[PDB]
């Protein structure tokens, strides 16, 4: 906890000072890929999102968000579109004092903090909502510089990705007085959200994966159905992206969310 948070405090230092100093030497400037970044996020309330619903190699594997992310942009040059598992009350999450989760990890190794502390309406909205069902809100954060490996390791090169920042329920502070199949359509519901943002912004490349299942205590055999009713069996997003990954990164003994998506998919 104590060097994720001094990494923490330094991301932050890097952002205002708009550059960083990669293990070689290199002196790299990020602050007009940041503000760039900063500029052109936007909120999508559920109304908006469910407008765009009126209007593919898939794999699974062990790796982080970031370094299914950096696979793909070394390999073609669309920028990739990667779900952050967001808080609903906080930007970044817990990062700034050291907690360990996928949302913290993006924080600390990104601008996506520059991008999500800009939008203060949609932590507003949750904190004054008081339901861990959250809302189907989502943050979309265009060309994210990216400028850390998963050891904290500053990069020689930064990449650019985009995220989508939308909060799964928290099926673990709901306990049973939501059934399953609520839960389900709540889901369902906010993926589907998810795929049209990433589609209308033009992203043909995805990194997902075990969305709700940690911090927030989904079921992961649920959350894999969920996009799989999305993605396969002629599902509204069947064909529409060109490679997704279920980018499955879990410490756990048996890494059991890993393995519920590699079942299904
Ligand atoms: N870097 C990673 N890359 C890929 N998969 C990961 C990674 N880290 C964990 N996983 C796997 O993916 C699963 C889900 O990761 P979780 O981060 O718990 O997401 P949530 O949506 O349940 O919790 C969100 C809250 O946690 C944060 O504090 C937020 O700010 C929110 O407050 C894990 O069980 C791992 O199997």
């Known amino acids: 906890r104590h060097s994720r948070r001094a990494i923490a405090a330094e991301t932050v230092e890097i952002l205002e000072r708009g550059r960083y100093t990669a293990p070689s030497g290199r002196v790299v400037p990020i602050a007009d890929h940041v503000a760039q970044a900063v500029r052109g996020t936007r909120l999508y309330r559920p109304e908006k999102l469910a407008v765009l619903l009126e209007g593919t190699r898939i794999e699974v594997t062990e790796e982080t968000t970031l370094a299914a992310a950096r696979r793909l942009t070394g390999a073609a040059g669309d920028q990739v579109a990667c ?35 800009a939008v203060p309406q949609f932590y507003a909205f949750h ?10 809100h989502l943050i979309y954060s265009p060309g994210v510089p990216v400028f ?20 799964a329920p928290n099926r673990r502070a709901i306990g049973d007085l939501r059934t399953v199949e609520e839960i389900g359509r709540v889901l369902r519901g906010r993926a589907a959200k998810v795929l049209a943002a990433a589609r209308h912004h033009g992203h043909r490349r995805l990194v ?41 990164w879990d410490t756990a003994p048996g890494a059991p969310r890993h393995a519920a998506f590699a079942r299904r998919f």
Request: with cysteine.
């Open 148 to 167: 850390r490996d998963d050891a904290g390791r500053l990069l020689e090169e930064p990449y650019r990705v985009a995220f989508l920042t939308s909060p």
């Open 127 to 136: 904190h004054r909502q008081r339901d861990p069902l959250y809302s189907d």
């Open 83 to 117: 779900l952050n598992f967001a808080s609903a009350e906080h930007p970044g999450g817990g990062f700034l004092s050291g907690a360990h989760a996928q949302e913290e990890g993006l924080a600390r190794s990104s601008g996506l903090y520059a991008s999500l502390r």
């Open 208 to 248: 997902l994966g075990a969305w709700g299942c940690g911090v927030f205590g989904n079921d992961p055999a649920q959350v894999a159905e969920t996009f799989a009713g999305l993605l396969l069996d002629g599902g509204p997003f069947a064909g529409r992206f060109a490679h997704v990954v279920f980018a499955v």
